[PDB]
Amino acid sequence: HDSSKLLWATEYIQKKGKPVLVNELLDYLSMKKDDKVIELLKKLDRIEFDPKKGTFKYLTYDVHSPSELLKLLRSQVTFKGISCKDLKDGWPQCDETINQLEEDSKILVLRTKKDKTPRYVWYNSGGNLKCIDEEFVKMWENVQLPQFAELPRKLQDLGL
Amino acid sequence: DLDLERSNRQVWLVRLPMFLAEKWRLGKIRINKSKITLLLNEPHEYDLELTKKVVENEYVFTEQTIPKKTAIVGTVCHECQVMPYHKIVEQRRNIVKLNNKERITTLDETVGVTMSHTGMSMRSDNSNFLKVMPKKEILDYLFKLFDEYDYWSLKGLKERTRQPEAHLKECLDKVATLVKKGPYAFKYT
């Protein structure tokens, strides 16, 4: 099956991670010397097999920079939000970059330390603002509210 | 093709005692003209009564939605009943009021020999009742397996291969895309 030989060469195009030559990849695959796999190589959208000599470029997520990452955050406006699996392959070490891009610059998803923060795609406007003490958080949650029209009526007794 | 043969074979119908009819499962009938009898093949002699004279709307048929083969014999001509060493049959009727059943036996030993098999006895069972790979090499067999059946589950695939299943699971995520739900559930693509 030539599809097994082509996908292993396509894996070798991703395992090399550089722009190697077509005959050199044929020498790296050794026994693979066919021409129909090269016909599907330029036809492959992920493996950018350019005609200018041997150029093997992968796809996935090309955002290898935080400046590219902010445009990715501006890309998903009122759409969805990806995880981080395409990010860690298009760029080595991203969760450290999330820690440096704090305050709504990389509103990720700290799932677990054991999960090594399984990140997500989000960004607010201020994000952090963590000067609120947890003593203020408990008193914020210890308040019961008279619902419906009572609290508007109690606001007129209070002032608003 | 249910049809009628004659509907004219006039027969009779006699009620018998139990000992003679169930034996039958060729005598001589003497007809004296209004009190008939039977010379039995040997042995005793019995008298017949006319159970009913008008026996109309009563006939006789045989048999060889799903229909089946119908065979219409004939009619019924008269109603009859057999009436009966007569004291021996009365003694045989008296012997019928004597049959019964048995009683529960009693196991009569030193008990603990029989009682030892109840709980623990260290005599177990004695019965048969309800006892109950390289990366490029395995991928070449996987592409050979994907050429035959592509949308196939991994349960029979781990059975059909039965080699390095961890290396089989690594190659299944390598150059194949396992479809989660839908019709081809857990099926590579």
Curated annotation (Swiss-Prot), chain A:
Residues 1-64 bind DNA. It is found in: Nucleus. Present with 1150 molecules/cell in log phase SD medium. Belongs to the TFIIE beta subunit family. Recruits TFIIH to the initiation complex and stimulates the RNA polymerase II C-terminal domain kinase and DNA-dependent ATPase activities of TFIIH. Both TFIIH and TFIIE are required for promoter clearance by RNA polymerase. TFIIE is a tetramer of two alpha (TFA1) and two beta (TFA2) subunits. This is Transcription initiation factor IIE subunit beta. The lineage of its organism: Eukaryota, Fungi, Dikarya, Ascomycota, Saccharomycotina. The chain holds residues 123 to 283 of 328 of the full protein.
UniProtKB/Swiss-Prot annotation, chain B:
It comes from the Eukaryota. It is found in: Nucleus. Disulfide bonds: none annotated. TFIIF is a general transcription initiation factor that binds to RNA polymerase II. Its functions include the recruitment of RNA polymerase II to the promoter bound DNA-TBP-TFIIB complex, decreasing the affinity of RNA polymerase II for non-specific DNA, allowing for the subsequent recruitment of TFIIE and TFIIH, and facilitating RNA polymerase II elongation. Present with 520 molecules/cell in log phase SD medium. Belongs to the TFIIF beta subunit family. TFIIF is composed of three different subunits: TFG1/RAP74, TFG2/RAP30 and TAF14. This is Transcription initiation factor IIF subunit beta. The gene is TFG2.
